[PDB]
Amino acid sequence: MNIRNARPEDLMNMQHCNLLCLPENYQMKYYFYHGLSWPQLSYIAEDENGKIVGYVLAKMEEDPDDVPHGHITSLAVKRSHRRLGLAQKLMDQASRAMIENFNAKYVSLHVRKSNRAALHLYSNTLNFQISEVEPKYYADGEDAYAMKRDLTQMADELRR
Amino acid sequence: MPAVSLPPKENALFKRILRCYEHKQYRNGLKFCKQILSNPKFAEHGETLAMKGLTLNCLGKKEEAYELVRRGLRNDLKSHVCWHVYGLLQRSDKKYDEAIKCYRNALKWDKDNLQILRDLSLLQIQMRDLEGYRETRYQLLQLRPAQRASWIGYAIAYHLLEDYEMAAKILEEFRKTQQTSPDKVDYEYSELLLYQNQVLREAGLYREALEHLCTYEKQICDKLAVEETKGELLLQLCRLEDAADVYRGLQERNPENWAYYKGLEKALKPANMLERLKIYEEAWTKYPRGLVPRRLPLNFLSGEKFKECLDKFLRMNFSKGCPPVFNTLRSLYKDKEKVAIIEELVVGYETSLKSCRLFNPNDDGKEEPPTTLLWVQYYLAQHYDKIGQPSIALEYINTAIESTPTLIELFLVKAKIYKHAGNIKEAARWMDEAQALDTADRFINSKCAKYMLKANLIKEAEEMCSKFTREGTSAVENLNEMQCMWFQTECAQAYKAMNKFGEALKKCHEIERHFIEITDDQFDFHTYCMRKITLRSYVDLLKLEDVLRQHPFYFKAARIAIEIYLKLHDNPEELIPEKLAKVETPLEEAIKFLTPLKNLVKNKIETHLFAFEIYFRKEKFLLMLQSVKRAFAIDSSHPWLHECMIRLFNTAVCESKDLSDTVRTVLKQEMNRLTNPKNFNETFLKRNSDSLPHRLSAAKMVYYLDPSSQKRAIELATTLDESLTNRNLQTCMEVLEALYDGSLGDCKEAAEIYRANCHKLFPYALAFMPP
Ligand SMILES: O=P(O)(O)OC1[C@H](OP(=O)(O)O)[C@@H](OP(=O)(O)O)[C@@H](OP(=O)(O)O)[C@@H](OP(=O)(O)O)[C@@H]1OP(=O)(O)O
Numbered sequence: 001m002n003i004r005n006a007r008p009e010d011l012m013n014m015q016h017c018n019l020l021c022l023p024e025n026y027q028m029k030y031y032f033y034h035g036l037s038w039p040q041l042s043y044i045a046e047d048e049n050g051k052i053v054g055y056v057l058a059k060m061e062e063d064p065d066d067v068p069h070g071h072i073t074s075l076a077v078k079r080s081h082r083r084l085g086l087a088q089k090l091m092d093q094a095s096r097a098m099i100e101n102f103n104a105k106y107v108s109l110h111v112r113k114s115n116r117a118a119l120h121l122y123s124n125t126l127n128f129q130i131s132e133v134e135p136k137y138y139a140d141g142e143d144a145y146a147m148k149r150d151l152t153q154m155a156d157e158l159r160r
Numbered sequence: 161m162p163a164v165s166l167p168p169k170e171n172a173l174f175k176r177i178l179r180c181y182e183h184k185q186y187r188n189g190l191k192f193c194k195q196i197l198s199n200p201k202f203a204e205h206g207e208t209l210a211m212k213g214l215t216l217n218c219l220g221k222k223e224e225a226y227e228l229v230r231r232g233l234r235n236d237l238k239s240h241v242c243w244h245v246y247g248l249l250q251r252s253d254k255k256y257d258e259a260i261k262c263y264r265n266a267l268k269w270d271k272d273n274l275q276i277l278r279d280l281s282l283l284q285i286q287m288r289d290l291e292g293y294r295e296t297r298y299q300l301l302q303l304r305p306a307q308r309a310s311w312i313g314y315a316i317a318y319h320l321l322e323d324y325e326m327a328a329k330i331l332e333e334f335r336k337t338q339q340t341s342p343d344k345v346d347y348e349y350s351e352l353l354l355y356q357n358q359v360l361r362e363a364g365l366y367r368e369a370l371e372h373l374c375t376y377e378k379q380i381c382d383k384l385a386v387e388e389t390k391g392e393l394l395l396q397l398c399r400l401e402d403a404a405d406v407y408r409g410l411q412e413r414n415p416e417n418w419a420y421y422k423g424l425e426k427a428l429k430p431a432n433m434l435e436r437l438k439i440y441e442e443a444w445t446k447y448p449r450g451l452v453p454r455r456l457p458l459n460f461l462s463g464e465k466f467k468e469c470l471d472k473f474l475r476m477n478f479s480k481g482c483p484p485v486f487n488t489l490r491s492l493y494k495d496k497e498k499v500a501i502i503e504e505l506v507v508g509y510e511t512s513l514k515s516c517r518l519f520n521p522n523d524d525g526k527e528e529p530p531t532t533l534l535w536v537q538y539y540l541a542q543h544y545d546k547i548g549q550p551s552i553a554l555e556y557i558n559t560a561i562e563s564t565p566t567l568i569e570l571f572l573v574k575a576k577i578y579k580h581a582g583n584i585k586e587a588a589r590w591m592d593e594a595q596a597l598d599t600a601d602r603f604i605n606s607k608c609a610k611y612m613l614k615a616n617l618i619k620e621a622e623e624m625c626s627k628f629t630r631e632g633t634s635a636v637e638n639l640n641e642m643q644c645m646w647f648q649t650e651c652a653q654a655y656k657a658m659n660k661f662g663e664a665l666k667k668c669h670e671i672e673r674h675f676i677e678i679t680d681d682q683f684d685f686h687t688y689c690m691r692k693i694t695l696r697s698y699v700d701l702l703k704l705e706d707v708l709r710q711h712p713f714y715f716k717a718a719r720i721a722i723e724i725y726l727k728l729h730d731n732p733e734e735l736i737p738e739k740l741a742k743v744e745t746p747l748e749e750a751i752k753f754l755t756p757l758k759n760l761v762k763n764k765i766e767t768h769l770f771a772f773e774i775y776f777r778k779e780k781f782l783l784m785l786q787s788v789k790r791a792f793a794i795d796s797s798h799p800w801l802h803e804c805m806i807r808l809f810n811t812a813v814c815e816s817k818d819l820s821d822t823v824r825t826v827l828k829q830e831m832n833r834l835t836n837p838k839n840f841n842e843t844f845l846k847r848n849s850d851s852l853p854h855r856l857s858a859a860k861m862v863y864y865l866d867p868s869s870q871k872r873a874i875e876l877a878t879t880l881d882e883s884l885t886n887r888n889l890q891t892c893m894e895v896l897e898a899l900y901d902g903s904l905g906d907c908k909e910a911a912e913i914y915r916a917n918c919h920k921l922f923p924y925a926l927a928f929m930p931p
Contacts, residue, residue: 001488002452003416005384008700012678012711016646020606023628025642028674029681032701036685039697040382048491079603080572083482084451089416096413100383101347117600139630 001053001081003089005097006042008035013052014044021076034059034073040097041070045077045086053081056090060102069148070098072109091126099155106151110137110144122147163241163270164207170196177211181218189215206236210245217249225249240270247279254680256283260292272303281313282686288706290321308334309690319699324363331356348693350381355695357389366396384413391423403427415447421456437461455488467501474506475519478535479528483569485535486542493546503543509536534560534567541573548888550581550924568597568604575611582889582925588615595624602628606646613650616658621651643674645713652720661724662737668724668753669735671717675709709756715764718753722770725750729777750774765794765801772804779816781823784808785830792834799857802844806861809837838865845876852884852891860903867905874899874910880917892918893927 006014011031019025034042038059045054054077061071072094077086091107098104109128111118122128128147137144164174173192180189193212197203213228229249233242247262263280267273281296294317301310311334318327335356338344353376360369370393373386380386387410394403404427410420421439430436443453454476457469477485492498509519510533517527537560544553557574564570571594578587591608598604605628612621625647626635639647648667655664682705689698708714729746743749751774757767772787788808791801812827841861848854859877863870877895880887896914899907918928 001416002418003414004419008697008704012713015643019642019644019646021603023602025644028643028678029684032681032685036689036694036697036701037692039694040384047487079568079601080487081484083480084484085449093414097382097384101350101381 001045001047001084001086003043003045003086003093005040005093006035006044006055006057007039008032010044010052011035014042014055014057017052017055017076017078018057018074021078022074024074026074031057038101040101041094043090043093045081045090047081053078054086054090056094058094058098058107060098060104061108067105068102070094070102070104070107070151072107075109087121088125095149095151095154096158099151099158104151105155107149109147110134111147112138112140112142113145114142119145161241163236163239166196166202166205170199170202174208174211177208177215181211181215184218186215186218204235206232206234206239207241207245208232209235210239210242214245214249217252222253238269240266240268240273240276243269244273244276244279247276251279251283256287259283260287260289272299274300274303277303282683285316285320285686285702286683288320290317293317294321308338308693311337312690312693312695316695316699319359319362320702324359324365327359328356328363328365331359346379346381349379351693351695353380354382354385354389355693355699358696361389361393366393369393370397387413388419391420391427395423395426400427400429411443411447415443415450416452418452418456421453433460433462434465437465458489458492462498466498467505470501470505474509474539478509478519478532478539481531481535483538486539486546490546499543499547503547506536506539506543510540530563534564538570538573541570541577545573545577545580550577553577554581566597568594568601571597572604572607575607578924579611579614580889582893582922582927584611584615585926586924588612588617599627609647610650613647613654616654618651618654640670643677645671645674645717649713649716649720652717656720656724660737661728662739662741664720665724665740666735666737668717668721669740671713672753675711675714679705679708707760710760714756715761715767718757719766719770721753722750722774725753726773726777747774747778762790765791765798768794769798769800769804772808776804776807776811781808781812781819781827785827789834797844797848797854799853802841802854802857803861805831805834806837806841806864809840810865813837838862841865850883850885852879852887853894855879855884856891856895856898860898863904870905870907873904874907877904878910878914878917880921889922889925892921893925896927 011034012028015026015028015031034057041058041060043056044052046052055075056072057074059071059073061069072091075087075090077090095104095107098107107128108131109122111122113119113133123130126149128149130145131148132146134144134146136142161175161178164171166174173196177189177192177196180186180192190212193208193215196205196208197212202208209232210229211232213225213232216228217225226249229242229246233239233246236242243262243266247259247266250262251259260280260283263276263283266276267280270276277296277300281293281300284290284293284296294314297310297313297317301314304310311330315327315330315334318324318330331352335352338349338352353372357369357372360372370390373380373390373393377386387406391403391406391410394400394406404424407420407423407427410417410423414420421443424439425436428435428439430439437457440453440457443450447453454469454473458466458473461469474485489502492502512518512520513528513533513536515521517529517532518525519528519532537556541553541556541560544550544556547553554574554577557570557577560567561570561574571590575587575590575594578584578590588608588611591604591611595604595608605624609621609624612618612624622635625639629635629638630641632638633641636651648671652664652667652671655661655667682701685698685701689695724741725743725746728741728743729750732746754767754771754774757764758771761767768787768791772784772791775783775787785808788801788805791798791804795801808827809831812824812831817824841858845855845858848858856877859873862876863873877898880892896911896918898904899911899914915928916930918925919930922928
C-alpha cells in the first residue's frame with residue numbers, strides 16, 4: 001500500500017474511511033481545519049486504485065500545557081488491510097513531520113479505557129504509554145486514557 | 161459613523177448601537193435602537209433602522225430585519241453604512257453576489273473604507289471574481305502597506321489569475337520584509353518560501369526555483385517538501401545524477417511511497433527489465449520489512465523472474481498470515497497469463513502442504529504450522545471467485561470455515577462470493593454472521609449494512625448502523641448529520657430498486673446538500689490562512705472547491721436522480737419524498753443535477769449519454785447533437801451511445817422538423833459523415849457481433865426499426881455461446897430484463913426459456929431462478 005502525505009483532495013476520502021471504521025466522526029470542515037493548519041502531519045494509505053485503506057489525521061496541540069506536542073485526532077486502518085503494519089508506518093510518518101515542522105517533543109492521543117484493541121495496538125506496537133485519565137471524556141460518558149509517545153529519540157536519530 | 165450626522169445624545173446612542181453589535185450585546189443594542197427611533201425627529205433615520213434590522217437578524221428575525229434594512233436604506237441611499245448593512249445582511253443568507261453589489265455601492269460614498277474593502281474582497285475570492293479581488297487587494301495594500309495580510313492577498317490575487325511572474329515579484333518583496341522582522345515564526349516563513357517556490361515552478365521557471373530552493377533550504381522546515389520538489393526540479397533540469405541521490409534519500413524516509421520508485425526509474429533510466437528490477441532488489445536488502453519494493457516488480461516482471469518473485473512474495477505473506485494478499489494482486493489479474501502462474505503455484509502450495517507441511521516438497525525449512533495452509537485456501541477462495549468459478553471458490557471457503565470458525569475474513573469472502581454469484585440475499589446473511597463475530601468493529605458493521613441495503617432490507621440496515629450511531633437520535637438522521645454519503649448513496653439505489661422514487665430522490669438531494677455545505681466550508685479559511693500563511697494548502701483548497709463535485713459520490717447520486725427524473729417524465733428545511741416525486745418539471749430538475757457533470761466530469765461517457773436522454777425528451781436537437789458527439793469522442797463503439805445515435809438519426813428523418821432547413825439538414829450532413837440507419841445498425845452488429853453488450857444494443861435497435869424482425873432480434877440478443885467476449889451475469893440480466901422491458905415486444909415466451917437457460921449458467925443468480 002502507498003503511504004503518502006495527505007492533501008486537501010484526500011480529505012473526503014479520509015472522511016469516508018473514518019465513517020466506515022470508527023465511531024468518532026467529524027464534519028468535513030474539521031478535516032479542512034487540519035489540512036490547512038498542519039498540512040505536513042496527516043498521512044494516508046492507498047491501494048492500486050487510489051482508494052484509502054488507512055489514514056492518520058494529526059495536529060499540534062493548540063495550547064500545550066507544557067512543551068509543544070502533536071496530537072492524533074484519528075487513526076484507522078480498514079480491517080481488510082489489517083496486519084500490514086500501516087498503523088505503525090502512518091504513525092511514524094506523522095511523528096517525523098511533527099518533529100521537523102513543529103519540534104514536537106511527544107505525541108498524545110485518547111482512547112476509551114474499554115477499547116482493548118486500540119490499547120493493545122498503541123501500547124504494545126507503537127510504544128505509547130498511559131499518562132492521565134480524562135473523566136467522562138466521551139459523550140457516551142466513558143473516561144479516556146491519554147497516551148503519550150516520547151519523540152526525543154526519534155528526533156535524535158534524525159539529527160545524526 | 162460619519163455617514164450618520166445626528167445630535168450628540170443620539171450620536172452617542174448610535175455609537176453604542178454599533179458597539180453593542182460588535183460585542184454581541186444585541187438585547188442592549190436593541191434598547192438603544194428604540195431610544196433613537198422613539199424620538200419623532202429620527203423615527204425614519206436610516207442607519208438606526210438599518211442597524212436595528214441587522215441586530216434583529218442576529219436573533220433570527222429575518223423578515224423584520226429585511227423590512228428595516230430595506231426601509232432604512234431607501235431613506236439614505238448615499239449612506240455607506242446603509243449599503244454596507246444591506247450587504248452584511250444579504251451575506252448571512254449566502255447571497256454573495258447581491259452582497260457584492262451593496263459593498264461596491266457603499267464604497268461609492270466611502271472610497272477608502274477598510275472594513276468594507278476586507279469584507280468585499282473576502283466575497284470576491286469566494287465567488288472567484290478574480291479581477292475584482294485584485295483591485296480590492298491592491299486598494300488595501302496602498303492604505304495599509306505595513307500589514308502582512310496586505311501583501312499576501314495581493315500575491316494570491318495574481319497567482320489565481322495565473323500572472324505567475326507578477327505573483328513572483330510581489331512574494332519576493334514580502335519575503336524581504338519578513339527576513340528582517342524578529343516577529344517571524346520559523347514555520348510561517350518556511351511556508352512563505354515553499355509558496356514562493358511553487359509559483360516559480362508553476363511559471364515553468366525551473367532553474368530559478370532550484371536556485372531559490374537551495375538558497376533558502378535551511379530556513380524551510382518541511383523537509384519532505386524540500387526534497388520532493390528538489391527531485392522534481394532536478395529531473396526537470398536533467399540533473400539525473402543528483403536526482404537519483406535525492407530519491408534515494410526519499411525512499412529511506414518512506415520506503416512505502418510508490419512515487420520515489422518512479423523517480424528512481426526516471427533518474428537511472430534502466431535499459432532492460434532486469435536493470436529495472438535491480439532498483440527494487442536493492443530496496444529489499446536495504447528495507448527488508450518493506451512490502452512495496454517486493455510488490456511493484458510483479459507489475460512489470462514476466463517469464464521466470466515473475467514466478468521467482470511471486471514465489472518469494474506469496475511464501476512471505478502466507479507464513480506471516482496477512483489477509484490482503486489477494487487484494488494486493490488483483491491488478492495482475494488483468495493479465496490472463498500471470499493468473500495461470502498464480503493458479504498453478506498456489507494450487508501446488510496447497511497440494512504440497514497437505515502431503516507434507518512444506519511449501520514445496522524440496523524445501524529445507526522447518527515445517528509450516530497449520531495456519532499457512534488456511535491462508536492459501538483463503539487465497540484460492542478469492543482467486544476462484546475472481547475467475548468466475550463460484551462453486552469451486554465456495555468449496556475452498558467452506559473447508560476453511562470448518563478449520564477455523566473464528567476468522568472473520570472467511571465470512572466476508574464467502575459473502576463476496578455469493579454477491580459476485582448474483583445471490584445478495586445469501587451474501588447478506590453471511591455478513592450478519594461476520595458482523596456478530598466482532599460486535600466492536602464498525603468496518604464489519606458497515607459492510608453488513610451495505611449488503612443489507614443492496615438487498616433492499618433498508619429498515620434492517622438502519623438498525624445495524626444504529627449500533628455505531630450517536631445515541632441521541634435515529635440512525636438515518638445522524639448519518640446525514642455526519643455527511644455519510646456511502647450510506648445515503650447505497651440507500652438511494654435501494655429506494656430506486658423498489659420503485660420508491662420519492663425516498664431515493666430525498667437521499668440524492670441530501671448528498672447535494674453536503675456538497676453545498678462543503679463548498680461553503682472554504683469561507684472561514686480565506687482569512688484564517690492569511691494569518692497562518694499555509695498558502696500552498698490554501699490555494700489547494702481553492703482549486704479543490706472549484707472542481708469539488710468531481711467526486712465519485714456526487715456522480716453516484718446524480719446518476720440515480722437523473723435516472724428517476726427520466727423514468728418519472730416517461731410515466732408520472734424539508735425534503736419530503738412525496739413532494740419530490742411530484743415535480744411538475746422533472747427534466748428541468750435532472751438538468752440541475754447534470755450541470756456540474758457537464759462542467760467537471762467530461763471524462764465519463766455517461767455524462768454525455770445522460771445529457772442526451774434529457775435533451776432527447778426535451779426536443780432540443782442542437783443540444784442532442786452536442787451530447788452524441790462528445791460521447792463518440794470517448795468511445796465510438798459504446799452500446800448505449802449506439803442506441804442514442806439510432807434514436808437521433810430517425811426522429812430527424814421521420815417527423816417534427818420544426819426548425820430551419822439548415823438545422824434539419826445539418827444533422828443529415830453531420831450524421832452521414834459520422835447513409836441509412838438500418839445498415840448503420842447492421843454494420844455495428846457486424847463489427848461487434850462477438851460482444852454481447854453490443855449485440856443487445858443492436859438487438860433492441862432492430863426492434864426499434866421494425867416489429868417484424870422481432871424474432872431475429874430475440875435470437876441475436878439471447879446468444880449464449882462462449883464465443884461471446886462479454887457474456888457475464890450482469891449483461892445476461894440486462895438481456896432478460898430487456899425482454900420483460902417491453903423494448904423487445906412482449907417476449908414472455910422467450911423470457912422463460914431464457915431465464916431457465918441462464919439458471920443453468922449462473923445457478924446462484926436470483927434473477928434467473930424458477931418461481
Ligand atoms: O466501486 P466502489 O464504489 O469503490 O465500492 C466497492 C467497495 O468499496 P468500499 O468498501 O471502499 O466502500 C468494496 O470494498 P473494499 O475492498 O474497498 O473495502 C467492494 O466490495 P465489498 O463491499 O463486497 O467488499 C467492491 O467490490 P469488488 O471487489 O467486486 O470490486 C466495490 O464494490 P462494487 O462492486 O459494489 O462497486
